Scaffold this active site. Structure first.
Site, PDB file in Angstrom:
ATOM      1  N   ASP A   1       0.802  -1.263  -0.096  1.00 40.28           N
ATOM      2  CA  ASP A   1      -0.015  -0.034  -0.011  1.00 40.28           C
ATOM      3  C   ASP A   1       0.857   1.096   0.056  1.00 40.28           C
ATOM      4  O   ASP A   1       1.963   1.322   0.716  1.00 40.28           O
ATOM      5  CB  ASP A   1      -0.782   0.277   1.272  1.00 40.28           C
ATOM      6  CG  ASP A   1      -1.913   1.060   1.248  1.00 40.28           C
ATOM      7  OD1 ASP A   1      -2.849   1.224   0.403  1.00 40.28           O
ATOM      8  OD2 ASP A   1      -1.692   2.041   2.078  1.00 40.28           O
TER       9      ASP A   1
ATOM     10  N   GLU B   1       1.112  -0.644  -5.321  1.00 48.44           N
ATOM     11  CA  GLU B   1       0.177   0.478  -5.601  1.00 48.44           C
ATOM     12  C   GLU B   1       0.979   1.884  -5.855  1.00 48.44           C
ATOM     13  O   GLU B   1       1.538   2.109  -4.696  1.00 48.44           O
ATOM     14  CB  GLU B   1      -0.885   0.886  -4.593  1.00 48.44           C
ATOM     15  CG  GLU B   1      -1.399   1.974  -4.736  1.00 48.44           C
ATOM     16  CD  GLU B   1      -2.400   2.163  -3.461  1.00 48.44           C
ATOM     17  OE1 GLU B   1      -2.018   2.576  -2.421  1.00 48.44           O
ATOM     18  OE2 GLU B   1      -3.756   2.028  -3.608  1.00 48.44           O
TER      19      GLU B   1
END
Lengths: 710, 737
Positions: A347, A395
């Protein structure tokens, strides 16, 4: 000569490695890093004394014999596995120099494998305490889990279909009919459903230990998604049916049971990890693990000593510091080798490329947070002897303004969440000028982002909807977010969703609007399932889950975030369509390719065969590809508001057979031999199929197959 | 102990296998659960066997089971089989292969790398190889030359990522092991082995890792001396050459080993040495020499009395313990930039055959015939850091001197890295945070290093190569006195932010000319050495050349020991060791202990001891953590005049140092130092002193031994002293209070 527990246990010097607590030689060795501490102590708790907030025993650490370099260590001889441990440190307190040493705090070792705070989800401690004292689990000399011969599946990445799942929300609703709703064991009962849906990989939302009551005192909301990690080595204990029984061993064993049961059915597991910040927040946050040990080492700090905010959550982890590098690599290796996890998804991964402050000309002899082309942590992860052969997905952006989609430092190994695919597909399917060429590029695996650097089509992770943002059903129902239930006056949430309500706003509409919405959901799934790359879709998108227009639902432990097994049965047609389309993707050898498609295999068409329309006004993309199994397939997308009759490629000696048509009513939207009316339904379109024609509704999609005709 | 293997099938199913070591045969049980697609039973054919073993129901049709048995004496083998339904169709694995299961070995675990033993006695093997597509393990018995046992590793069960692993119930009857990568049958050495065998040049270059583990060593009350950096006096020695001669008095087969070095600790104690720097002790080949190592975890076996690896380990530990008992630190020269392997199969011994791409730089560097390590690759980083931590934790080593340090900032392609990761990892390793690290720019390779600022983080010490050049040029009447002034004060132009303690000064090392050769040999081929033969080349009988040479040796030692920094002495420079004018470090010979009774050796050793004692006694000047204040140093010329800074004909300089006053607590005097490199005498004037204070002369290198150093005439202030040619003088002010 020194003794600890009423004269029963001997205290020795110990070893500085490995870090954490390790069981050997009839005892436990403790090792912890601290550069700034001037004194240290080991604190032990019984489970009863931890509830009362009392330290059972304290063992001071001698700076002469219990310290090698910057590592404090000690050995205790005895039976300690029924106890919990923590650390006490002394030093300088100066927040304006980044020092937070205080002798009244008992902090948790970052290397602890289980953290014992509370047993039940959502229930505070005695007196409404939302932040009770935490302590770490002490290991056993042996192992207590049977893997039953489990071996890694090692699926090629091009063969993956990824299903994003929230662990608690999967079975928390009453209609799941499982013995332990909302736990690791509860999800095992529902793996056969995922297997019959056609998925072979599950991506779990954050399962590291976190506080779901972290901001329950102010306001009253929960933390449901769990993007605020306390300990990176531990599972979330309140996702387990045991709780704090046996000091976290039951929770660890339940997670291992879930992994083993998933692997036994041919499903891989990918873990969400949040390494870009910590639940400790800024200088006003609680002191749990890192701030009480080495604040200036574990966090990125400005000259004055205030915290950089690149994650938008309060602090930022100092990822590229060498000590933090070792820690992160050790954590990933531990999860891979002890919990048999097949891969990770990172993330806000752009934070892991920002520079460390140790390379400023003041320190040696380009400041803190400057992005690097060869960050040492990514180099260590990609070339690790163990981690280099697992699935790594990034990401590739953060909240500090970085955006690295297509340019993440990959070493030809790293995959990416393709958000350009998301934007292009969302804009094309709803109907927008100037997106046909981008759509055709998306269908081919985005070679314009990956081919030059030496990566393959399957390095692209394609998705239309995720846990953040609109669901698939809300993508066709709302033109704007409705986030007023969050309590932030509609400020939070993505503002440009690129959606269309298909004519009317809200779930109350006419019959034609609902028909169009069903068509559009089918079109989105068809677009996902015929693209090069790895498709991924979110939990419940296969039956049309709705959140009421709320596109940021992080703070609701409520059925808006639960899988609706009762509502799934009312939408069996869409679920059947998705299962059949995933089966079709698995059956075709031209759909998941190891290399980018060439012009000899793939041909582009338009309304007439061989004349594609790349003009700005175009809302029509069609192609045909050669298949070693089905001979030839033909796909067309009509994103226009006008119906059209299209011409089919001319293949003498063969004819086209209809397979998929998102405009047709179910179950004729997908043709199978289980249908008793298949031949008759095909025969009723023969006057169009004979002359190489096919009539299409507006906002529809078709798939056809070539078969011999003589 | 039983092993279990679960195979996914090509028809969405599971096959479970168990291998049990029955109480000496082997039993393999196969269990197939589930029934969706196949109904009428299965037959287990051994991968195309014409026969078959039908699977019988176990618990009511839920599972089908079969059992196979194998007789003992069978070396570890693999069982391969296929499944067939009652139609002719074949069931395979999900990778479309026959079910293959090991019998006789376990799967093993990927950590730790190398050979390890579990509590039950199982032996685990693990080795990293990304490029090899096949790995085999060899076991050898006491002699071997050919493997007694050969075990191929299954690419599916015996791998985790890029680490090949295997487990063995017992290694009884075996002493050594090796690895074979690819299809090549050449046995390779384990990079992580802690004990190795003998380097045997077969008819080739092979070495085997030992299956024995080093016994536990009792350190006792051993403690690290933890000496401050500003109080170090370093002696660099070669283990083999230090005691190899008969004159050392050591018993045979113990001379030239670690025991021989430990037996001479009184020599270092009398010299004033409190730190010993050893030349590289990693195992090496005699063809290339000690600066081209093979292995990073063992001492060289030839440095022990018995000639074996375990003997070397115990001897090295004994020597370290003896040194620490005497308050002396042990530092090691380490080579981590290149190895002794070659770019072919004949000279492959280890990392070159396991994974060439990861461990080594492709194509090397232009104009070089050595295997350059890929230092900043993460796997090599891990290996180097593991080696350093192993030496510190297991041998209690106090510091490291990194040979060819500038090479450590080169990247995989040979480019210069602005942020080298290995150096940063060494600097901030929490275990090593109390050990000394020194960077040495000298290189044994044919190419020469270019100069750039080394990243230090105020932690790295450096070997000051400019110091030797400048002192040599000054004593040759070829340098400006400003250079001498800079070098005498701790080299502030290079260590301004670090301090004088980080400058490691020397006038002669194990390469180039020795101390005696520096004043005896100067041809046109020795121009890069800044030497002056004092009138005649080679040995001489002239009475003036001898006097000049003796004066020059005294001057060299004096200037070395009165400068700010750490003085580093090379072995043999205290007793007139000579190499007949050669500049090759391989041309140096064994030290001769016979001459440590004559006049010359006595003068040199006494002068060195006097200088070390004076440095200790006046540590407020010579053992500082920060440079002397500019308000306390005055530079003078011939007669208390302004020095000629830019005149390259005045080879004369005087230095007046004023002592500080510390209010924490005593009066300490001043210092006056004169250097005359001219061939003519120069008149010098002493600075004015306080009331009732006089100057006491401590050193005059033109006098006669004994007497040229004394711990002697008193001289009033504003007097005149005659400094002879090639002479250095030292004064201290004493208050007649």
């Amino acid at each position: 000569e020194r003794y600890a527990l009423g004269g029963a246990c001997r205290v020795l010097a110990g070893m500085p490695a490995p870090l954490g607590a390790t069981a050997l030689d009839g005892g436990v060795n403790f090792a912890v890093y601290s550069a700034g501490a001037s004194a240290a102590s080991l604190c032990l708790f019984t489970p009863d004394d931890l509830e009362a907030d009392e330290v059972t025993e304290e063992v001071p650490l001698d700076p002469l014999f219990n310290r090698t370099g910057n590592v404090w260590h000690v050995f205790i001889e005895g039976e300690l596995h029924n106890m919990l441990y923590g650390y006490r440190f002394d030093g300088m307190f100066a927040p304006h120099c980044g020092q937070y040493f205080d002798v009244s705090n008992v902090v948790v070792d970052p290397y602890a494998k289980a953290v014992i705070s509370r047993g039940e989800y959502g229930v505070p401690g005695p007196g409404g305490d939302c932040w009770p004292q935490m302590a770490g689990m002490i290991p056993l000399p042996y192992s207590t889990f049977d893997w039953q011969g489990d071996l890694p599946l090692r699926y090629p990445q091009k063969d993956l279909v990824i299903y994003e799942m929230h662990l608690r929300g999967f079975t928390k609703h009453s209609s799941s009919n499982v013995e332990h709703p909302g736990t690791y064991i509860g999800a095992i009962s529902k793996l056969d459903y995922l297997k019959e849906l056609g998925v072979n990989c599950v991506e779990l939302m954050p399962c590291h230990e976190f506080n779901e009551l972290e901001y329950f005192s102010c306001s009253s909301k929960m933390n449901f998604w769990g993007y605020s990690t306390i300990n990176f080595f531990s599972p979330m204990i309140r996702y387990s049916s045991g709780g704090i029984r046996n000091c976290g061993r039951d929770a660890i064993n339940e997670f291992k049971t879930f992994v083993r049961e998933a692997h036994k059915r041919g499903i891989e597991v990918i873990m969400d990890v949040v390494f870009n910040h910590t639940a400790e927040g800024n200088e006003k946050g609680p002191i749990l693990s890192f701030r009480g040990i080495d604040n200036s080492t574990y966090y990125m700090l400005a000259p004055k000593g205030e915290f950089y905010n690149y994650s938008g959550c309060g602090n930022t982890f100092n990822c590229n510091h060498p000590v933090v590098r070792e820690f992160i690599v050790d954590c990933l290796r531990y999860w891979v080798t002890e919990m048999h996890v097949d891969g990770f998804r990172f993330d806000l991964a752009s934070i892991m490329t920002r520079g460390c402050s140790l390379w400023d000309p003041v320190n040696v002899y380009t400041t803190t947070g400057t992005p690097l082309a060869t960050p040492p942590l990514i180099d260590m992860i990609s070339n690790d002897p163990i981690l280099g052969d697992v699935k790594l997905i990034a990401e590739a952006w953060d909240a500090g303004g970085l955006y690295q989609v297509g340019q993440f430092p990959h070493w030809k190994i790293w995959s990416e969440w393709n958000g350009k695919y998301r934007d292009i597909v969302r804009q094309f399917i709803k109907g927008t000028d100037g997106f046909a060429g981008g759509f055709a590029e998306c269908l081919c695996g985005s070679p314009h982002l990956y081919q030059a650097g030496g990566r393959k089509p399957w390095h692209s992770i394609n998705f239309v909807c995720a846990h953040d943002g609109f669901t698939l059903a809300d993508l066709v129902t709302y033109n704007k977010k409705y986030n007023s239930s969050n309590g932030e006056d509609n400020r939070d949430g993505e503002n440009h969703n690129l959606s269309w309500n298909c004519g009317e706003e809200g779930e109350f509409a006419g019959l034609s609007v609902k028909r169009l919405r069903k068509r559009q959901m089918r079109n989105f799934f068809v677009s996902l399932m015929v693209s090069q790359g790895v498709p991924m879709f979110y939990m419940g998108d296969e039956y049309g889950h709705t959140k009421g227009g709320n596109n940021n639902t992080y703070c609701h432990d409520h059925y808006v975030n639960y899988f609706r097994w009762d509502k799934k049965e009312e939408s069996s047609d869409l679920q059947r369509f998705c299962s059949l389309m995933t089966k079709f993707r698995k059956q075709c050898e031209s759909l998941g390719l190891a290399d980018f498609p060439t012009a000899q295999r793939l041909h582009w068409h338009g309304h007439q065969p061989g004349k594609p329309d790349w003009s700005e006004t175009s809302r029509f993309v069609a192609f045909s590809t050669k298949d070693e199994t089905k001979g030839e397939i033909y796909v067309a997308f009509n994103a226009s508001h006008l119906p059209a009759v299209v011409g089919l490629p001319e293949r003498p000696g063969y004819r086209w057979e209809p397979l998929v048509d998102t405009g047709k009513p179910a179950p004729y939207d997908f043709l199978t031999d289980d249908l008793p009316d298949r031949a008759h339904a095909v025969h009723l379109f023969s006057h169009f199929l004979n002359s190489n024609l096919y009539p299409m509704l507006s906002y529809s999609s078709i798939i056809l197959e070539l078969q011999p005709d003589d | 102990a039983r092993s279990c293997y679960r195979f996914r099938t090509d028809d969405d199913g599971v096959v479970d296998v168990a291998v049990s070591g029955e109480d000496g045969g082997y039993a393999v049980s196969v269990e197939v659960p589930g029934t969706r697609g196949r109904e009428g039973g299965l037959v287990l054919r051994a991968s195309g066997s014409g026969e078959g073993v039908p699977l019988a129901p176990a618990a009511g049709g839920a599972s089908l089971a079969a059992e196979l048995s194998f007789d003992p004496t069978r070396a570890p083998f693999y069982l391969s089989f296929l499944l067939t339904d009652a139609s002719g169709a074949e069931i395979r694995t999900h990778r479309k292969t026959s079910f293959r299961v090991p019998v006789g070995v376990g799967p093993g675990s990927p950590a730790p790398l190398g050979m390890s033993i579990s509590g039950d006695g199982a032996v685990n093997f693990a080795v990293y190889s990304k490029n090899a597509n096949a790995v085999s393990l060899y076991l050898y018995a006491a002699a071997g030359d050919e493997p007694a046992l050969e075990i191929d590793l299954d690419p599916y069960i015996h791998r985790t990522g890029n680490v090949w692993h295997v487990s063995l119930a017992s290694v009884d009857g075996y002493v050594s092991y090796a690895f074979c990568c690819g299809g090549i049958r050449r046995p390779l050495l384990d990079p992580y082995a802690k004990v190795i065998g003998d380097f045997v040049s077969s008819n080739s270059m092979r070495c085997f890792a030992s299956l024995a583990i080093a016994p536990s060593y009792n350190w006792g009350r051993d403690r690290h001396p933890r000496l401050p950096l500003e109080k170090l006096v370093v002696y660099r020695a070669n283990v083999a050459l230090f005691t190899k001669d008969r004159s050392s008095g050591l018993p045979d087969d113990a001379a030239g080993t670690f025991t021989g070095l430990s037996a001479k600790v009184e020599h270092f104690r009398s010299l004033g040495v409190n730190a010993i720097l050893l030349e590289p002790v990693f195992p090496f080949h005699q063809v290339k020499g000690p600066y081209f190592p093979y292995h990073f975890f063992s001492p060289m076996n030839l440095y022990s009395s018995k000639g074996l690896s375990v003997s070397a380990i115990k001897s090295m530990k004994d020597m370290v313990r003896v040194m620490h008992r005497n308050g002396i630190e042990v530092l090691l020269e380490v080579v981590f930039t290149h190895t002794a392997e070659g770019e072919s199969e004949c000279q492959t011994i280890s990392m070159r055959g396991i994974d060439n791409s990861s461990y080594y730089i492709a194509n090397g560097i232009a104009g070089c015939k050595a295997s350059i390590l890929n230092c900043n690759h993460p796997v090599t980083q891990k290996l180097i850091l593991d080696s350093l931590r192993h030496w510190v934790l297991d041998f209690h080593v106090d510091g490291f001197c990194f040979i060819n340090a500038p090479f450590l900032v080169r990247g995989p392609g040979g480019e210069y890295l602005s942020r080298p990761p290995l150096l940063e990892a060494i600097t901030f390793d929490p275990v090593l945070s109390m050990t000394k690290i020194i960077a040495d720019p000298w290189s044994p390779l044919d190419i020469s290093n270019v100069q750039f600022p080394f990243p230090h983080w105020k932690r790295w010490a450096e070997v000051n190569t400019r110091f030797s050049i400048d002192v040599r040029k000054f004593l040759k009447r070829e340098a400006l006195i400003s250079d001498l002034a800079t070098r005498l004060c701790g080299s502030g132009d290079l260590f301004s932010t670090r301090g004088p303690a980080f400058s490691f000064n020397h006038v002669s090392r194990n390469s180039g000319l020795s101390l005696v050769d520096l004043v005896s040999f100067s041809n046109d081929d020795l121009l890069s050495e800044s030497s002056w033969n004092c009138g005649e080349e080679g040995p001489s009988e002239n009475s003036a050349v001898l006097q000049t040479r003796l004066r020059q040796i005294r001057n060299f030692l004096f200037i070395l020991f009165v400068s700010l920094g750490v003085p580093v002495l090379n072995m043999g420079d205290e007793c007139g060791h000579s190499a007949a004018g050669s500049v090759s470090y391989k041309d140096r010979g064994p030290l001769n202990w016979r001459g440590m009774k004559t006049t010359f050796v006595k003068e040199v050793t006494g002068f060195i001891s006097f200088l070390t004692a004076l440095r200790s006694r006046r540590g407020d000047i010579f053992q500082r953590r920060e440079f002397l204040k500019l308000e306390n140093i005055h530079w003078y010329g011939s007669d208390l005049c302004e020095p000629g800074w830019d005149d390259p004909t005045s080879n004369f300089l005087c230095m007046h140092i004023n002592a500080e006053v510390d209010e924490m607590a005593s009066v300490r005097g001043d210092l006056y130092i004169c250097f005359n490199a001219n061939e003519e005498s120069v008149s010098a004037a002493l600075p004015a002193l306080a009331e009732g204070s006089v100057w006491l002369r401590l050193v005059d290198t033109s006098l006669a031994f004994p007497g040229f150093f004394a711990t002697v005439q008193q001289v009033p202030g504003l007097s005149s002293y005659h400094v002879e040619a090639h002479t250095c003088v030292l004064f201290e002010s004493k208050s007649a209070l």
